Amino acid sequence: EVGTVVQEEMKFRGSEFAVKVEMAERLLIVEISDVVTADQWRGEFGPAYIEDLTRKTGNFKQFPVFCSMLESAVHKSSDSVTLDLLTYSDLELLRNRKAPQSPALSAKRYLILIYTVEFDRIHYPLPLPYLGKPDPAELQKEIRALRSELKTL
Amino acid sequence: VGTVVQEEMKFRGSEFAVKVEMAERLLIVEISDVVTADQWRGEFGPAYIEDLTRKTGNFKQFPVFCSMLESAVHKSSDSVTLDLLTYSDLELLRQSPALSAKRYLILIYTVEFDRIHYPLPLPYLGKPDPAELQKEIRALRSELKTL
Amino acid sequence: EVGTVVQEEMKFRGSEFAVKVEMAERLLIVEISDVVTADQWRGEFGPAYIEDLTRKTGNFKQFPVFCSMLESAVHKSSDSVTLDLLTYSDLELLRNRKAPQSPALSAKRYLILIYTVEFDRIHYPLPLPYLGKPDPAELQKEIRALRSELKTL
Amino acid sequence: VGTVVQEEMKFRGSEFAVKVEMAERLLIVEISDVVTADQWRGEFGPAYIEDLTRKTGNFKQFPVFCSMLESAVHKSSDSVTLDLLTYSDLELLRQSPALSAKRYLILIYTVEFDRIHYPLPLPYLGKPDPAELQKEIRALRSELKTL
């Protein structure tokens, strides 16, 4: 963690997404992009949110460890952690079958950090709001910036 | 060859990204509304450009012409200036949905007591697929990291 | 678990001990014997004690899972769990240096169930009261029982 | 050979575990106080046993003698009975700490109009190392599981 940014492409249920995790001073940022449809979700989580979230699972983690787990899962560099991406409808079925949708919730995606060790099987859910498609202006506005820095060197 | 100029310029109350690029035997002119991200694009050959300049009265050779257009975009010459206007705006100076959309980049050349107007037709491309734009943003970001 | 009894010999810090774990209906029993000096400690723990004990560690386990972990550690059949045996003096130093003894506490041993997985490092402590040396009568009384059952078959 | 008898019996207000075992050319007698776990043990050869029985008056051959002692422990004969008493109790019928401790298993043989008293000296072993006893308990428990 400590200022670092990890971004990788990965396929969730037969679709390429761009995933960007960024650990900053007392804030974790997750950003996902549908690379085919350019749809986007983003989440911001504080150390309190995160730690209190893991406590709910009975399997606590401290904020830096969690971010480190997440980094590891994005990097696919650790067999004990894995990701998944779900919709609220999907999310209920895997907990409702175990035993009414607003605009913001309906488009929401849940990034599920999945922790598997010899005696625990834990799912840590990170809720990501639908952020819309981006503005093709600003993308171009921004591409015109990168083009010049590239030519500078 | 391959020389590229990119500059920002205003055309009748709006901001445009103008990119001109001279390949061998091909002039490429792209125009984007920096705000609405509307894009227009022309590709012109030597034969076309020389045929065009004569038609208007003051023929220039293709390299010389591109060169002027490069100066115009650098705003680095008095003899040349640019305008941008529609088939309606052009009609008055002298329509299908395609025509209603396309733009004309005018190279306004000054000599002696008169000004010559060189119209380049630039077709409409549409707005871009922002997916496509992000994939390309991803590529440029990886060029910078390694470098 | 569910009625089962596991007993094995194992060396803690250069001494052979006999360890006996027994999982019964809502009660876990741990019994340790110094095989050279015949000293003995025993502990009985309920599902509430155990579960509330794991919660304290931030890394919950349900009673049957914990007993199963413990069985696994005694059986040395799982790389993620290991045992250790400590005295209260030992126990403090590893937590006091990280930053007055009654009879019953002084002779007490702590069986430390040690859980190591990719992102957690947990020590689960089971306190065992010193039960004295056994009565050589009852041992003999009992050996005279086994001798006859053996000859019966 | 190898025949073993184990029975419980009372001797002057106390409970004892008596084990008698006839190997070839050796009689083994062990006695344990089932309560205090005090243990006494004798090992007697044929020559010793025959020399002993004559001394007392009514010689028996070694196999015959052991056999009687086995009957005595099974309490399965009228002619024989057992007692257990100390060098002090024995003196009266006719001391270093070792002697003060040791016991005598008496085989009381009845014939015609008299009773013959056969004393076997059984040394003190001490109480046992309960460590040792547990190690042995562990061994027997593993014999039973497999079987």
UniProtKB/Swiss-Prot annotation, chains A, C:
Other remarks in the entry: The N-terminal 3D structure (head domain) resembles that of NHEJ1/XLF, PAXX, SASS6 and XRCC4.
Chain intervals for the UniProt region annotation (Head domain): 1-134
Similarity section: Belongs to the CCDC61 family.
Location relative to the cell: Cytoplasm, Cytoskeleton, Microtubule organizing center, Centrosome; Cytoplasm, Cytoskeleton, Microtubule organizing center, Centrosome, Centriolar satellite; Cytoplasm, Cytoskeleton, Cilium basal body
Superkingdom field: Eukaryota
Domain statement: The coiled-coil domain is involved in microtubule-binding.
Residue span relative to the full protein: 2 to 163 of 511
Subunit organization: Forms homodimers (via head domain).
Described purpose of this protein according to its UniProt entry: Microtubule-binding centrosomal protein required for centriole cohesion, independently of the centrosome-associated protein/CEP250 and rootletin/CROCC linker. In interphase, required for anchoring microtubule at the mother centriole subdistal appendages and for centrosome positioning. During mitosis, may be involved in spindle assembly and chromatin alignment by regulating the organization of spindle microtubules into a symmetrical structure. Plays a non-essential role in ciliogenesis.
Protein name as annotated: Centrosomal protein CCDC61
